């Protein structure tokens, strides 16, 4: 069946004196965004962001919009509480984030579930892998943890992660089976760039690949490098595929000694390129 994930990334940011916090939730299947909710609209609604979601009927959008609106109120409260727990100066913008969702392996049994939270960009509380206990990041989040233990909330999240989360991931993969599920293998090449009288930069490119995960490295004679290698962050092309490059500075006349290596799910055998 090969692995997949459903994930939501949710952010609220306070703007004191200038209105209610701005709240945005975005949903992904694997590396593909498919839904959003943004509180900055006259009439905010949960909305499709992938073609294959557009034929979900109105009851889907209604239910999801109700859940997102409840979350919006939860985030407003949490921003206020966290500020009190951490004894911060009033005024000032703060952020609360949540990331949650499910991964499946080669069956419809949940491989891993997530329910993690962050305040001001740093861990606050997260549900452990057992889906039974909580890791509190500090003594402020310990207050929250005791509240959530007494409520039995781990059971609530466990039920979602094992049930409805995986059910709907399954449905999304069917709706977008065409585009999700594909593997676009990287097209690779090396470019050559004079640097000085003594050396040159060789740059090894991987273009148009999906999914985003890839390994791209240079070697000097079968061994990984004893020198600096520039490796840029994997980056979106905009059209649903990804790009990456790795550059080495090498002495003139020794260009043939260096090999670029590309590993990706969509490649029968790893690629080896040489200038």
């Amino acid at each position: 069946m090969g692995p997949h994930s459903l994930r939501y990334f949710v952010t609220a940011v306070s703007r004191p004196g200038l209105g209610e916090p701005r709240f945005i939730a975005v949903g992904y299947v694997d590396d593909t965004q498919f839904v959003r909710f943004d509180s900055d609209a006259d009439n905010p609604r949960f909305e499709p962001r992938a073609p294959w979601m557009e034929q979900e009927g109105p009851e889907y959008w209604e239910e999801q919009t109700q859940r997102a609106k409840s979350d919006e109120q939860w985030f407003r409260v949490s921003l206020r509480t966290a500020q009190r727990y951490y004894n911060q100066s009033k005024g000032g913008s703060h952020t609360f984030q949540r990331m949650f969702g499910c991964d499946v392996g080669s069956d419809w049994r949940l491989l891993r579930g997530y329910q993690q939270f962050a305040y001001d960009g740093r861990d606050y509380i997260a549900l452990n892998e057992d889906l039974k206990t909580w890791t509190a990041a500090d003594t402020a989040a310990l207050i929250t943890r005791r509240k959530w233990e007494q409520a039995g909330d781990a059971e609530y999240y466990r039920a979602y992660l094992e049930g409805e989360c995986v059910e709907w991931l399954r449905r999304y993969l069917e709706l977008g089976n065409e585009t999700l599920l594909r593997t676009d293998s990287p097209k690779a090449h090396v470019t050559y760039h004079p640097r000085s009288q003594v050396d040159v930069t060789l740059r090894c490119w991987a273009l148009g690949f999906y999914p985003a995960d890839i390994t791209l490295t240079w070697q000097l004679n079968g061994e990984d490098l004893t020198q600096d290698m520039e490796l840029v962050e994997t980056r979106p092309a905009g059209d649903g595929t990804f790009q990456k490059w790795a550059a080495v500075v090498v002495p003139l006349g020794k260009e043939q000694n260096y090999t670029c290596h590309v590993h990706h799910k969509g490649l029968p055998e790893p690629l080896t390129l040489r200038w």
């Binding site: 839904v35 859940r67 979350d71 409260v77 999240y157 989360c165 059910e167």
Partner: peptide
């Protein structure tokens, strides 16, 4: 499918 947070912080 989106799930709302159960309890307050």
């Amino acid at each position: 499918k989106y799930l709302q947070v159960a309890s307050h912080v």
